Each structure stands twice: as C-alpha cells, then as structure tokens.
C-alpha cells in the first residue's frame, strides 16, 4: 500500500473557519472519529542477529496495531448533554480485531511534491488458547509494548480517494494524558493507492488540493526522519 | 437583513452623490450669476458650496467606513436539498389522507 | 483588493475636487476658445469622475453580493388505501 499524504497544522481559533471552508469545498459535513494505536518494539531482553537466512541485512522496525472504540468510553461526566458533532474537539476472553501495520521510510528525492510511504497491513480477526491476549501474542511473536496514543478528530470524503484528517493526539499513560497537539489541530491529506499513472495522478490531486488551499492553510511535506519507525 | 440595511446605506450614499450633483449645478449656475455682475446671490452660493464639500466629506467618511466594514466582514458573515422535498411529500400525503 | 479602492477612489476624489477648483479658477480668468474647451473638458472629466464613483460603488455592492412513526403510519394507510386489500 502506497499512501500519499500532505500534513498541516491549525490553531484552536480557526477550527470553525477550517471546518466551514472544507465543508463548503467538499460539500459534506465532517465525520467525528477516533482511533487508538499501540506500538510494539522488539524485546530488549532478547538478542537476535539482524540477518535473514539468505545472508541479507535486516533493519528492525516497530509494529503498530490500531483499532476503534466508541465515544462512550471517552466522554466523562462533564461532557454529557452535548451535540455529537465536530464541536466536541474544542472542549478538550478473546481479543478485538486489531490492525497490524509496519511503516517504512518514505522515498528519497529532493524537491518532492508528496510524501509516499510503504506500509504493510494485516487484519488480526481474533485469537484463542491459553495466552489469548494480544499482548501475550505480541510477546510470542517477539515484541513488547513501547507506547500508545489515542487520536480524536474529524475526517472528510472528497474525490479520488482523498482524506482530510483534522485530529488531535493524546498520549495514554498512567501518570497522565499529555496532549501532543496542544494549541491546535493536526491536518492530514492522504490517499491510499494499491501504477505510475495512478501515482502521478494522485500527486496531481494533492497538488490541486494544495493549490486550492493556497493562501489559507499551507500543506508542506514532512521530513522523512519524522516518519521512520525503525529502532536504533 | 445585514446586506439589506447596508445596501440601503449604499443607496443613501448614491443619493448623497446625487445631492453632490445638485450642489454642482448650483455652484456652477449661481457662480455664473456671480459672474454676470450680481452679488446678492453670494450667501446662497457659499452655502451651496459648503453643503457641496460637506456632503462630499460625509460621502467619504461613510464610504470609507463602509469599505472598512467590507474588510472587517471577511470570514464572519461573508463567504470568501431533498429534505424539504421529502417533508413536502409528507405534508402533501397527510393532506391527501386527511382532507 | 480593498487598498486599490482606497488609492483609486481617493485619487478620483482628489482629481474631482482639485480639478473642480482648477476649473472655477480657469473659468474666471484664440486664448478664449482654448479656455472654453479646457473648461468643458474639465467639466466632462468631473462627469466621468462621478460616473467612476458610481461604478466603484456598484463594484462594492457586487462585493456584498458575491417523525418515523408518522412516516410508518402515513405510508401504512397510504399502501392500505392504495391497494384496497
């Protein structure tokens, strides 16, 4: 899967203006959503030679499992009796079917227009047995829990497979939940492509989005080192 | 409405331009009277020219203030369905079943 | 785009007023015929300035321009009355 994304960032004041702008452009109201992502890193207690059976170098990469969870577990006591829409973000036995993914380093190339990234994905339906927990499954594969983050935001559905993710991200720990996007919202614009003509056409769609949004919000290209999940 | 009242204010500015034209025909005509050899039409002349530049100045203040409203209205109250048909068919259907 | 209306409109106002004073100061002083046509051209330029103000204000105006139970029962009696079962 080749995902082509362009990111951005806004403040806590222009949220209604960006929601109104993208609502007038896309012609559809935003859809509230959230997702929890847990990252499993290789076990430091175990030591394995980074080499395949064919005498080839192997680079260690983290494994990210993501799923969904209804808002009934997210809304507390002071959030009740409120409209279930986009205006909520301004007030901030077996195992579940997880989504196993591994993201690679984006492609090179100076003066690039988009940010193409190769990500492998398999769907974990369920499990059983003695150690049926997903944590014990990752420990059986050879990975331990490193960190996790829960993101809540809104998404749009335009044309040509474009997604605009205006979301906030929090770090779920025991000592407290720290907001990484404290002060604004994180913007995203990605397309999932399963050919050179379709890749260049996707880049044309992203360039048309950046040209259409030019003047308001700027959508630059993130650094490769900021999307590399390899363990060093 | 907002654009209705402000549109009426713009029409008032246009009527102030018309008044500027009245005072223009008055300064030129009564000025020609002053240049025929008469001095008794002097007070109404000076009053008509003073009202000329006064109405013009009010047009500048209200017009520039209006443009300031145009600058201060971008983003707020200015842009930079089958539901009504379904409800229409429901009310019409209820009108058929209940004459 | 409003600053172009500031500079342009203000320039039309200064040309209108100052050109009007130049007009009245030239009406009061083949030289005579050249005064006739200079005064007439100043007047027509004032008319074009007023019309310009009207066009610009028109551009400003153009800038100002630019439940389920009742359905289940309703369709229920509608179908029962329609088919006459």
């Amino acid at each position: 899967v080749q995902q082509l994304s362009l990111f951005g960032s806004i403040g806590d004041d222009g949220y209604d203006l960006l929601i109104s702008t993208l609502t007038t452009i896309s012609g559809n109201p935003p859809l509230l959503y959230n997702s929890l992502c847990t990252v499993w890193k290789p076990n430091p207690s175990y030591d394995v030679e980074n080499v395949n059976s064919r005498n080839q170098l192997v680079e260690p990469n983290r494994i990210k499992l993501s799923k969904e969870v209804p808002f009934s577990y997210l809304i507390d006591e002071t959030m009740m009796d409120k409209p279930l829409n986009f205006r909520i973000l301004k007030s901030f036995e077996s195992c579940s079917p997880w989504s196993l993914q591994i993201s690679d380093i984006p492609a090179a190339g100076n003066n690039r227009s988009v940010s193409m990234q190769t990500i492998a994905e398999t769907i974990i339906l369920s499990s059983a047995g003695k150690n049926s927990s997903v944590s014990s499954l990752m420990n059986g594969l050879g990975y331990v829990f490193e960190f996790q983050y829960l993101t809540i935001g809104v998404k749009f559905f335009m044309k040509h497979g474009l997604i605009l993710e205006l979301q906030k991200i929090w770090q779920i720990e025991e000592a407290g939940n720290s907001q990484i996007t404290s002060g604004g919202f994180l913007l995203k614009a990605y397309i999932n492509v399963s050919d050179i003509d379709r890749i260049n056409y996707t880049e044309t769609a992203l360039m048309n989005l950046k040209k259409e949004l030019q003047g308001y919000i700027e959508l630059s290209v993130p650094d490769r080192q900021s999307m590399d999940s390899r363990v060093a | 409405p907002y654009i209705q009242e402000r549109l009426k204010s713009l029409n008032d500015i246009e009527t102030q331009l018309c008044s500027m034209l009245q005072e223009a025909s008055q300064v030129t005509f009564i000025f020609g009277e002053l240049k025929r050899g008469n001095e008794s039409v002097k007070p109404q002349f000076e009053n008509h020219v003073k009202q000329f530049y006064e109405r013009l100045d009010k047009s500048t203040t209200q017009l520039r203030k209006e443009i300031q409203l145009l600058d201060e209205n971008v983003g707020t109250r200015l842009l930079p369905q089958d539901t009504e048909k379904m409800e229409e068919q429901l009310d019409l259907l209820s009108a058929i079943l209940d004459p | 785009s409003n600053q172009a209306l500031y500079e342009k409109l203000e320039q039309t106002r200064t040309i209108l007023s100052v050109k009007l004073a130049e007009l009245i100061n030239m009406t009061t002083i083949a030289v005579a015929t050249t005064s006739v046509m200079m005064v007439n051209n100043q007047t027509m330029q004032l008319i074009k300035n007023v019309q310009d103000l009207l066009i610009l204000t028109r551009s400003i105006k153009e800038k100002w321009l630019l439940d389920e139970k009742q359905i289940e029962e309703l369709l229920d009696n509608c179908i029962e009355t329609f088919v006459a079962e």
Binding site: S9, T181, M227, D228 | K50, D57 | -
Partner: peptide, 20 residues
C-alpha cells in the same frame, strides 16, 4: 475644512516513534 501552534514534524515523529 476637510482633510485628505506546534510542529508537524515533531507530532508525526511522536506518532511514529513516541518521543516528546
């Protein structure tokens, strides 16, 4: 009479590595 928020690369770096 008249007069004439934050850093996108750092946030994404957190979403991919988890460093603050």
């Amino acid at each position: 009479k008249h007069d004439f928020p934050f850093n996108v690369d750092d946030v994404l770096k957190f979403t991919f590595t988890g460093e603050k």
